[PDB]
Structure 1
Amino acid sequence: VGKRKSSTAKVFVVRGTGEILVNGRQLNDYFLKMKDRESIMYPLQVIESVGKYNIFATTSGGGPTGQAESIMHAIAKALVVFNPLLKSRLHKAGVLTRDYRHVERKKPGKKKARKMPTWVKR
């Protein structure tokens, strides 16, 4: 299980020939942006194991890019079980780190998190 922003991705990674199914449908159908797909691939790409592992991802919450990132994160963790010696390498690549970047709340006086309303000296 991986997470990012509001997204949560439970991912079943298995040893069969490398095909993808995100949330009960084809990968290109779910993630339209190629960037998201590339990100998802990256844990399998740092290893030479894209094509080796079948991946069945199941996402919930957040938006598409965040969902894709959560899936990627989950996949790295799943891969770590298949061969523990690659764990360090995955960590170095920056896939085993849970991306903490959390949406800052709207503070009272400010308009958004940081965006304050205009100041007036005179």
Structure 2
Amino acid sequence: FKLHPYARAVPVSPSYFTRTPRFYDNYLSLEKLMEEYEDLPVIPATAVERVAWKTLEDIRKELGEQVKASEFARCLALVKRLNSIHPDLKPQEIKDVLDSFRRNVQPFTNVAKPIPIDQFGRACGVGKRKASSARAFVVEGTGEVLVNGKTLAEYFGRVHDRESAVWALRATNRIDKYNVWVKVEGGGTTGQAEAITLAIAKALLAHEPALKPALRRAGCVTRDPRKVERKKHGHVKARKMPTWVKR
């Protein structure tokens, strides 16, 4: 029942004094397999199925060590080299060793919902600029634009805003082929005009999705996120500071 009369402590792994014991043990195993199966034929690089191997951080975490990047770079070469062996000729051992280096990560998928088209033929686009949120209903009209019930000249007194409001139709030269009925809320004069731009753009794409490359270059697809900065305590404004008296 008592302990054995003779006993002595012995390290489990032979690489007991190395920097990363667990890593080198797995690395030497590969090198041991790259000496008896190195005569097997290989497959051309371009004919090797793409494998998403693990990264340096992944190995560091799963092993609990601080393996050096350089040492791992040369250890990954063995994997790629041992992966070029012919599948039919590849042994079962290497196969089992080549599944522990694969990276089973899947990025999140966020597919936006496409804009439908009503039964009567109106697509509803949404644009925003600095306070506002427009809702443009684009149909196969003849160029009559109504902003919040009023016309383009009765709502916008600045011709600069009228042009930017329907820029999507102007850049693509379709002013005389669509009727737009928008409803805007919040914001100022230009803020609402810019909102209408992105709105008609999205709505126009629903009818003709092939115009995005052109609208991209016309500046009717980016949502300008610039927003009024807040007032900060100690400052007269967002940045302006009071007079600093040196004396």
TM-score, reference length from structure 2: 0.48
The answer on whether the counterparts of 2:166 and 2:196 sit within 8 Å (CA) in structure 1 is no
Which of 97, 103, 107 aligns to 2:228? It is: 103
Give the aligned partner of residue 139 of structure 2.
14
Q: Which has a greater percent of strand?
A: 1
Give the aligned partner of residue 242 of structure 2.
117
State the alpha-carbon separation in 2 of the partners of residues 99 and 80 from structure 1: 19
Higher RCO (CA-CA < 8 Å; seq separation 6+): 1
Unmatched 5+ stretches in structure 2:
1-125
Give the secondary structure class of the aligned counterpart of 1:38: helix
Which of 114, 117, 127 aligns to 1:2? It is: 127
Unmatched 5+ stretches in structure 1:
none
Which of 43, 52, 73 aligns to 2:177? It is: 52
**Alignment deviations for residues 56-80 of structure 1 (CA, whole Å, 9 cap, x no partner):** 0100011111011101110011111
Give the secondary structure class of the aligned counterpart of 1:60: coil
Instruction: Name the larger-Rg structure.
Output: 2
TM-score, reference length from structure 1: 0.96
- The residue type equivalent to 1:87 in the other structure is K
- The residue type equivalent to 2:185 in the other structure is S
Give the aligned partner of residue 203 of structure 2.
78
State the alpha-carbon separation in 2 of the partners of residues 51 and 112 from structure 1: 46
State the alpha-carbon separation in 2 of the partners of residues 56 and 16 from structure 1: 10
Runs of 4+ in 1 over 6 A off after TM superposition: none
State the alpha-carbon separation in 1 of the partners of residues 204 and 135 from structure 2: 13
Give the aligned partner of residue 194 of structure 2.
69
Alignment RMSD, CA only? 0.9
- The residue type equivalent to 1:109 in the other structure is G
Give the secondary structure class of the aligned counterpart of 1:97: coil
State the alpha-carbon separation in 2 of the partners of residues 11 and 41 from structure 1: 11
The Cα shift of 1:111 comes to 0.6
Aligned residues: 122
